[PDB]
């Protein structure tokens, strides 16, 4: 089997991407944030505290003839941005782009933190990291990909995120028309539950490539590119007037600037992030200070190849017995 679904930016900045997902019988379609940095499929629901729902579409398990309460199971998750959610668990039929999993754990939110409430465009998350990170207790549950894997034509999914445009998540096949050149594959460590890999270095604009190992995670659920402070300083030093602002929370730059590109290495291959992809617009409405799309990871504990980096590539998440990641230009 295979599946193919379009993923759409939630706003003009590509702050996140939503993909429609069918849950239950008859189908209830929710727009979920596919997140290769976490491993829970959770949704706004008829159980979510009413004051914490503000425009999201909800899953109502009582209206699904295939929903079954997973007795005794609870979940609770905290994300790197400080947001959180928790609740109980149903199993139900879940389909993405024509690919169907029966018995998928659908984590129904009873509580969500303010940032989820305040984003009416995201109805929940669909985790695509390794199932060892799934938070369901006392019986950990599998991700949608893990449940689907055995049925897929090939045990892979691909992320093809658009810049200011829709893109595609495919399951079970590699669309050879969706990228240019060849796909370069690189090793993955699953020890932390992430799609964790080592980039071979970077360049800023037309500058020379610096060969240096940068361990980080391929994370579709993080907006920006978070890299070591040395790398980030080297990038922003090429932008007149750019500075790190403690009050804003990262590097800002004059909105009048033209940003240089940023290249990262995948083995001997190179992925080029155009400068425009690094512009996240005014820090507040009407400001001439703009927020940068490359930021320091120094306060995170891990480097994160988020959407800014991934949207410059066609990315293969290879879930073979020994997982690997593939990157191609496009």
Swiss-Prot record:
Keywords carried by this UniProt record: Aspartyl protease, Disulfide bond, Hydrolase, Protease, Signal, Zymogen
EC annotation from Swiss-Prot or TrEMBL: 3.4.23.22
Domain Peptidase A1, chain residue ranges per copy: 17-328
Catalytic center residues: 35, 199
GO BP annotations, alphabetical order: proteolysis
EC class (word): hydrolase
Molecular function GO labels: aspartic-type endopeptidase activity
Residues passing through the membrane, by range: none
Reactions performed catalytically: Hydrolysis of proteins with specificity similar to that of pepsin A, prefers hydrophobic residues at P1 and P1', but does not cleave 14-Ala-|-Leu-15 in the B chain of insulin or Z-Glu-Tyr. Clots milk
Cystine connections: 255-290
Family, similarity comment: Belongs to the peptidase A1 family.
Protein's recorded name: Endothiapepsin
Gene behind this protein: EAPA
Whole-protein coverage range: 90 to 419 of 419
